[PDB]
Design an enzyme around this catalytic site. Sequence first.
Site, PDB file in Angstrom:
ATOM      1  N   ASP A 180       0.831  -1.196   0.000  1.00 33.49           N
ATOM      2  CA  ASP A 180       0.000   0.000   0.000  1.00 33.49           C
ATOM      3  C   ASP A 180       0.868   1.250   0.000  1.00 33.49           C
ATOM      4  OD1 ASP A 180      -1.895   1.940   0.395  1.00 33.49           O
ATOM      5  OD2 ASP A 180      -2.418   1.336   2.443  1.00 33.49           O
ATOM      6  N   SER A 219      -0.876  15.600 -11.971  1.00 38.24           N
ATOM      7  CA  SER A 219      -1.139  15.232 -13.343  1.00 38.24           C
ATOM      8  C   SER A 219      -1.409  16.493 -14.150  1.00 38.24           C
ATOM      9  CB  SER A 219      -2.337  14.282 -13.390  1.00 38.24           C
ATOM     10  OG  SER A 219      -2.769  14.036 -14.712  1.00 38.24           O
TER      11      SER A 219
END
EC number: 3.4.23.22
Length: 330
Positions: free
Chosen positions: A35, A199
């Site tokens: 994770d 992004s």
Amino acid sequence: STGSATTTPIDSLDDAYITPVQIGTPAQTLNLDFDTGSSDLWVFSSETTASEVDGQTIYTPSKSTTAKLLSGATWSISYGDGSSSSGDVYTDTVSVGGLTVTGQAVESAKKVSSSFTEDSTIDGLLGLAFSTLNTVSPTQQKTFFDNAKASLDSPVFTADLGYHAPGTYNFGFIDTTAYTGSITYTAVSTKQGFWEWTSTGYAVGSGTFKSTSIDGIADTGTTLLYLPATVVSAYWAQVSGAKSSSSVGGYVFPCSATLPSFTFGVGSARIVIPGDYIDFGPISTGSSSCFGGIQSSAGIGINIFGDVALKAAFVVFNGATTPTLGFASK
């Protein structure tokens, strides 16, 4: 040193991925969920409340000649889905894919929430976010990667998750045969303890690319792709009959649909998520309503590039002094 381990979907939907991890001496192999959005290595154990164990493999520290109680240390963690676990701590030898760390903090669960009990395929979590998020008190502990880093050939790990197929976590090297083209690297902020990046935009299907900054985290421990409501609405508007259902808890779509792809930007590069990756199947057995793999982050407080996004790429988690993230197509 390096390590290389195969990671395998837990079910037919890729709800999560498990990677075998050797703990203790002699080795006890547990299947852990790696994770990159948390920083605790915790396991089902001989200390876990018996009624809360249902089919998981447990770590038994008393059977490990290298286990030592980390006296006074406790831990308690909650996850984005409201699940939780807590307990005490041992140090022991931990190996992943041939890479060994001695003195790793292995957090032994005394309690786990119902969602963990009910999932027999996950024996614990192995956190790969920054150690500043580790929950051990009163002495915070380091992640497996942080402990391994100085010994690695290069201070990196890579995630290469499969779509309905196994994939690979590598430590200490970049497998140049595992991706196509070039890797595009992008800046990371560690201010919140995550692999947080921005992004450069998105496209829906064959549509035009929208240049827009989307701050979010690269999170292997989250199943879906969670993005701003504007983005998610633009995606689902291209699917006839798709709608946001408050009763189901997100966007659903007719199982008869063919889903469009979703593209996200990494600098000037583009990663394309095929439409099929966005299908999470019937909301309940036999239903003709299917659950979407792109959902709104509104009310989460952060955008999350979870497995839906990451499995479309070869992803480099560069833990150099100034960390960065790399993405390549594959």
